Amino acid sequence: PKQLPELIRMKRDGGRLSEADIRGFVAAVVNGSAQGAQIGAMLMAIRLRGMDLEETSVLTQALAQSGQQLEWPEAWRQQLVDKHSTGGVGDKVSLVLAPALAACGCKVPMISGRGLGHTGGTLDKLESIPGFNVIQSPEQMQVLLDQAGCCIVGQSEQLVPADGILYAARDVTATVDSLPLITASILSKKLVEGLSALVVDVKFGAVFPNQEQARELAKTLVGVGASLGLRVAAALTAMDKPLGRCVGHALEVEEALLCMDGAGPPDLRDLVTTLGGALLWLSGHAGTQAQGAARVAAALDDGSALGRFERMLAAQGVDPGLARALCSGSPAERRQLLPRAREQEELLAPADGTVELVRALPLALVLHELGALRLGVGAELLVDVGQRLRRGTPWLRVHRDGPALSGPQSRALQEALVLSDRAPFAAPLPFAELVLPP
Amino acid sequence: PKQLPELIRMKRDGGRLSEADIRGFVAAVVNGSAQGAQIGAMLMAIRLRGMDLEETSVLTQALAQSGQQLEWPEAWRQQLVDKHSTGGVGDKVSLVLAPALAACGCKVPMISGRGLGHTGGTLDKLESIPGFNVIQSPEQMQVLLDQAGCCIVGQSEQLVPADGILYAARDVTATVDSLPLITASILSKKLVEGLSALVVDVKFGAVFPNQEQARELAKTLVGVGASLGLRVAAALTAMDKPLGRCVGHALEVEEALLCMDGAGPPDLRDLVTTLGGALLWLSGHAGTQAQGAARVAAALDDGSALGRFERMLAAQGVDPGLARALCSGSPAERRQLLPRAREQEELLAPADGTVELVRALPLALVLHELGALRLGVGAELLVDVGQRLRRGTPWLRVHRDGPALSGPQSRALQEALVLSDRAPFAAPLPFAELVLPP
Numbered sequence: 006p007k008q009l010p011e012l013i014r015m016k017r018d019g020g021r022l023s024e025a026d027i028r029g030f031v032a033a034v035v036n037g038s039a040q041g042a043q044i045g046a047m048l049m050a051i052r053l054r055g056m057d058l059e060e061t062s063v064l065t066q067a068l069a070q071s072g073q074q075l076e077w078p079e080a081w082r083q084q085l086v087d088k089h090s091t092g093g094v095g096d097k098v099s100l101v102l103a104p105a106l107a108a109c110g111c112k113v114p115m116i117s118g119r120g121l122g123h124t125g126g127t128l129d130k131l132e133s134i135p136g137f138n139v140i141q142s143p144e145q146m147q148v149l150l151d152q153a154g155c156c157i158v159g160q161s162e163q164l165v166p167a168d169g170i171l172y173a174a175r176d177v178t179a180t181v182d183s184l185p186l187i188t189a190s191i192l193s194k195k196l197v198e199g200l201s202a203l204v205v206d207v208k209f210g211a212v213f214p215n216q217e218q219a220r221e222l223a224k225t226l227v228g229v230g231a232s233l234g235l236r237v238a239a240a241l242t243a244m245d246k247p248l249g250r251c252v253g254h255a256l257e258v259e260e261a262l263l264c265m266d267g268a269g270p271p272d273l274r275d276l277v278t279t280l281g282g283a284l285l286w287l288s289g290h291a292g293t294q295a296q297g298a299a300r301v302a303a304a305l306d307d308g309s310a311l312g313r314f315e316r317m318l319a320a321q322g323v324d325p326g327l328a329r330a331l332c333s334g335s336p337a338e339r340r341q342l343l344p345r346a347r348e349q350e351e352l353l354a355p356a357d358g359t360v361e362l363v364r365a366l367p368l369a370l371v372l373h374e375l376g377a378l379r380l381g382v383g384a385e386l387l388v389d390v391g392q393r394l395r396r397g398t399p400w401l402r403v404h405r406d407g408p409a410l411s412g413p414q415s416r417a418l419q420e421a422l423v424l425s426d427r428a429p430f431a432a433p434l435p436f437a438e439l440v441l442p443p
Numbered sequence: 444p445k446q447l448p449e450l451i452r453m454k455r456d457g458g459r460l461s462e463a464d465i466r467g468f469v470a471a472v473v474n475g476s477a478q479g480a481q482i483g484a485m486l487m488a489i490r491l492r493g494m495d496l497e498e499t500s501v502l503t504q505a506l507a508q509s510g511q512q513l514e515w516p517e518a519w520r521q522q523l524v525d526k527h528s529t530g531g532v533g534d535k536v537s538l539v540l541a542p543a544l545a546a547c548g549c550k551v552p553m554i555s556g557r558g559l560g561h562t563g564g565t566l567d568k569l570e571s572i573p574g575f576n577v578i579q580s581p582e583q584m585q586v587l588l589d590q591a592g593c594c595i596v597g598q599s600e601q602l603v604p605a606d607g608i609l610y611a612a613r614d615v616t617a618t619v620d621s622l623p624l625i626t627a628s629i630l631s632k633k634l635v636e637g638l639s640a641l642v643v644d645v646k647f648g649a650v651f652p653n654q655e656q657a658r659e660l661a662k663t664l665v666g667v668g669a670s671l672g673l674r675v676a677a678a679l680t681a682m683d684k685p686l687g688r689c690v691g692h693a694l695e696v697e698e699a700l701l702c703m704d705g706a707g708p709p710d711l712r713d714l715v716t717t718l719g720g721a722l723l724w725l726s727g728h729a730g731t732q733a734q735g736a737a738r739v740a741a742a743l744d745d746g747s748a749l750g751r752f753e754r755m756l757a758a759q760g761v762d763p764g765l766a767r768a769l770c771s772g773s774p775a776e777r778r779q780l781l782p783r784a785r786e787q788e789e790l791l792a793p794a795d796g797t798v799e800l801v802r803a804l805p806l807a808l809v810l811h812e813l814g815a816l817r818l819g820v821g822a823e824l825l826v827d828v829g830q831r832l833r834r835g836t837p838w839l840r841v842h843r844d845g846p847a848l849s850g851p852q853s854r855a856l857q858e859a860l861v862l863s864d865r866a867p868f869a870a871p872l873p874f875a876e877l878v879l880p881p
């Protein structure tokens with residue numbers, strides 16, 4: 006066995022770590038021996054010197070094996086699927102898609118995570134629901150799949166514990182945007198789920214603003230996935246604007262419910278059907294993308310996705326009365342049942358103009374500031390792309406716990422808003438492009 | 444004010460940190476805000492992406508200013524000197540030189556450190572002496588300079604606290620061998636000493652095995668030093684073998700006393716006179732190197748260096764009776780008054796041969812293992828360079844607290860010993876070469 010400083014050095018000098026090296030490190034992360042500073046140091050060493058595919062693969066196997074591998078009754082094998090995102094602002098697609106897919110006859114044991122970087126995390130969003138518990142054991146997860154068809158749980162002592170520790174550390178040390186670290190973090194989770202098919206939404210324009218990097222991530226997820234016996238596909242989607250109208254935790258549960266009522270914004274609905282469709286096709290439950298997309302759409306419209314979501318909530322510890330009130334309530338009734346912020350503040354158009362877009366990144370940065378978790382904090386987009394607005398009309402409603410937005414943070418959000426002199430137009434739908442295993 | 448993850452990113456991408464950036468980080472190290480993982484991450488980011496001289500300079504000013512700047516009566520100005528080493532195995536030159544120089548009329552407030560990398564630290568060595576306390580306040584240090592002419596103290600809440608925290612973190616994260624981190628760690632300490640002259644022993648063959656890197660370090664210490672108003676010079680010395688006959692904590696106090704009795708091995712004595720000589724010349728208390736070297740030699744021979752060392756010990760909390768017994772005792776009496784190891788084990792020559800050298804690095808690695816602090820653990824070289832030894836004759840005596848050396852650690856020490864078929868010869872003296880401010 007080598008000590009940590011020796012193995013850090015091996016990577017710091019451009020060297021390739023063996024399998025016992027990788028496992029030694031990971032196992033030290035798990036037991037407490039790798040002190041915080043050594044974890045920060047190795048993460049930065051990997052971030053800057055990289056890993057090649059053999060190494061990423063082993064990293065993935067090692068995080069996967071720090072906890073239990075999950076097992077299901079043979080009868081579920083071909084129905085087990087999942088959808089993971091590499092992250093986008095306002096992306097609440099997972100909240101909708103896990104129950105929608107359960108209502109199409111899939112079983113979905115989603116292991117997901119918390120806020121990472123400036124993208125928000127599904128786990129933090131679900132936690133805005135009083136009594137929703139993300140820590141769920143393997144036995145308990147089998148009961149969740151029985152009752153609801155799906156669940157959304159975090160990493161823990163028994164599931165990928167090492168990815169939870171490395172994940173929390175990356176968040177604060179600028180080692181989030183590492184291809185091998187992302188690949189091993191996503192794939193490790195999905196490997197322990199014992200899936201027949203996985204689709205991963207890779208966004209750009211997002212953790213890798215550049216189209217070139219996103220493609221490399223996509224083929225790395227897919228290639229590394231395929232070598233570990235996982236049928237993976239990736240979608241590349243340009244998200245320079247937030248998905249839908251909401252960014253937050255409670256606000257995004259609210260809008261995901263709107264989507265599950267068969268309403269909500271068209272871009273959120275479009276990506277839910279596109280991505281679930283793709284997944285149904287890949288898993289062999291739909292013959293084509295359009296057939297798949299329509300199966301998922303029908304679940305959003307007939308109330309059945311919503312019904313699976315209510316089962317999921319109650320099964321993960323939400324009081325049953327409260328789950329019913331949430332799924333059956335009106336938009337207004339849902340806003341009173343879920344965290345609100347202490348106060349709300351609207352921001353006003355500076356001049357006449359046509360909304361070209363709201364920029365995702367300035368918005369996420371400011372809300373991470375105000376979010377620093379507070380589950381009612383967030384923002385609400387009051388205008389659409391293509392809309393012509395006049396001077397003075399509200400365009401953002403920020404839900405905040407602290408004081409009136411400062412001069413700075415106000416200017417910073419105001420830069421998010423991009424107006425042209427272009428004639429009004431209808432808001433186009435988001436971009437998608439699949440990537441398969443070669 | 445920027446948050447830590449932002450400033451880590453700036454350096455991770457090859458970017459140059461401003462002065463407010465550097466100070467922000469350092470001040471966060473000091474207050475607890477920079478978590479262990481962020482410190483590990485920035486250290487590795489600096490280690491791999493480097494800093495240029497403006498940045499190193501500011502880093503140095505910032506670590507220096509995390510605590511108090513030390514002040515002395517105007518009358519001492521031109522007598523204040525110090526000697527720092529970038530590290531070598533068995534290098535106990537500082538223990539001898541601080542009191543020897545005090546006995547030549549200098550005042551020496553040495554701020555030194557602990558084990559870093561695989562080189563041992565002066566502070567750890569002095570601590571083998573019962574009741575020797577390295578934490579000493581600025582007011583207390585003025586009393587030490589009055590009574591003894593010298594002291595040896597560590598970093599603390601009031602002196603370069605930030606270098607103490609970064610120093611401990613580098614030790615475990617393979618960010619020791621960073622030019623800018625070494626420069627700022629050494630220079631920061633020496634800046635707060637308010638010196639008229641400083642000499643820094645740069646070893647190679649040591650933190651930078653390669654001659655090329657050592658030279659770059661030397662001109663960086665000297666150049667960065669000179670721009671901050673410090674008269675610095677560096678000596679380059681090839682230390683591929685241990686200095687003298689001892690490696691440890693208690694063993695090196697013992698040999699430094701032997702040197703102060705005017706005995707001891709010729710290489711230790713040579714480097715003490717060479718380096719102190721240089722320092723006296725640079726500070727203007729000697730006209731030439733040889734005059735300086737002879738002034739220091741005379742202090743080793745007339746018992747006066749020893750007398751200053753006893754004042755220093757008692758003044759830093761060693762019981763006065765115990766200080767007298769140590770300085771006045773015989774070698775044997777000193778070995779009973781200081782930590783011994785639980786057991787001793789000799790290692791035997793495998794075959795006939797002439798000692799070409801004992802290799803420093805294998806020895807340091809093995810003793811860091813067995814040292815993992817235990818202040819009686821160490822090794823003793825029983826043979827000299829040039830000596831012809833027969834099969835079976837003892838060449839190393841390892842003082843250890845644990846069990847009989849394992850098969851491995853035994854082989855690893857045995858590789859340290861390098862025998863030739865060369866006819867016997869007299870052991871040459873170590874290599875030295877000065878470097879001045881340009």
Ligand SMILES: N=C1CCCN1Cc1[nH]c(=O)[nH]c(=O)c1Cl
Nearest residue numbers: 090091092121125126187190191
């Ligand atoms: N979709 C989201 C929400 C926050 C982070 N993220 C992508 C992701 N997920 C991981 O599990 N691991 C990662 O490294 C990354 Cl990156």
Ligand SMILES: N=C1CCCN1Cc1[nH]c(=O)[nH]c(=O)c1Cl
Nearest residue numbers: 528529530559563564625628629
């Ligand atoms: N002479 C010794 C004993 C252990 C470390 N060292 C050199 C040194 N000293 C510092 O103060 N800071 C460093 O970075 C370095 Cl490197």
